[PDB]
């Protein structure tokens, strides 16, 4: 944002440095070089700003924007969630076959080399813990949310 205000070019002719710094508050934010290519600081200056925040407003944009009502007391496509619990695990076998491959070429060429070299193709190791988070929270949420409706609904 960076609000500005002019300085006199008459004092630019004088070579005199304006604005008489009397508080340890101005020279906190540094200007960009691209704004320094332009008229800063030969015809204008920068101003430090902040924002007036209050429970009048701050409470009522937080507790009004990201809110939902049923997205979680409901189940999720019950014949297909268990079907989606194979749509990941099937290639997770062969992705573990790559994890049954890449460790086997260790005790080899100095694994800092195994960082620059492997940038063409996907590694198992990072991708193999990627689905484990997905295959967990898709299951633990859907199992727990089903076992509350047994109690609550009769």
């Amino acid at each position: 944002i960076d609000a500005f205000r002019l300085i006199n070019a008459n004092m630019m002719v004088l070579g005199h440095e304006p604005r008489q710094t009397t508080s340890n508050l101005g020279h906190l934010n540094k200007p960009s070089i691209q704004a320094l290519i332009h008229g800063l600081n030969r015809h204008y200056y920068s101003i430090t700003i902040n924002y007036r925040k209050n429970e009048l407003e701050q409470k009522m944009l937080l507790n009004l924007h990201k809110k939902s009502w049923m997205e979680g007391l409901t189940l999720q496509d019950y014949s297909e969630h268990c079907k989606h619990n194979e749509s990941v695990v099937k290639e997770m076998l062969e992705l573990a076959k790559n994890y049954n491959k890449a460790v086997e070429e260790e005790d080899k060429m100095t694994p800092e080399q195994l960082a620059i070299k492997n940038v063409g193709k996907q590694d198992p190791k990072r991708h193999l813990e990627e689905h484990v988070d997905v295959l967990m929270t898709s299951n633990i949420v859907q199992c727990l949310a089903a076992m509350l409706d047994t109690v609550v609904f009769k």
Partner: protein, 116 residues
């Protein structure tokens, strides 16, 4: 022999007391076997007449059988021990898992995401 089901070889050893009298011990061993058969008359049996389980302990025909037939079930009838093998009330429990597992599933998520 008391450890396995064998009861008759136990009382064949009540025909074999060699050393001294052993009287007060085998008579307590009578009593702890009396309730045990009165315990094991209570399995899943059919009708038994008043001869077969009348002689599985020892007795010929005293009123001691009514002392057992009125203690537990297997009702005194027309030469009959009536079978109350219902075992029907307890199954079909979703609720007892649904209290315990909803505890356990959150217990999975405690040592899953929160660093310890």
């Amino acid at each position: 022999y008391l450890m396995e089901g064998s009861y008759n070889k136990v009382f064949l050893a009540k025909g074999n007391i060699p050393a001294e009298s052993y009287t007060f011990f085998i008579d307590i061993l009578l009593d702890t076997i009396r309730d045990e058969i009165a315990g094991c008359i209570e399995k899943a049996y059919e009708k038994i007449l008043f001869t077969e389980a009348t002689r599985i302990l020892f007795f010929n025909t005293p009123k001691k059988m009514t002392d057992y037939a009125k203690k537990r079930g297997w009702v005194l009838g027309p030469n009959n021990y009536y079978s109350f093998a219902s075992q029907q009330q307890k199954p079909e429990d979703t609720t007892i898992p649904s209290t315990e597992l909803a505890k356990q599933v959150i217990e999975y998520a405690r040592q899953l995401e929160m660093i310890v």
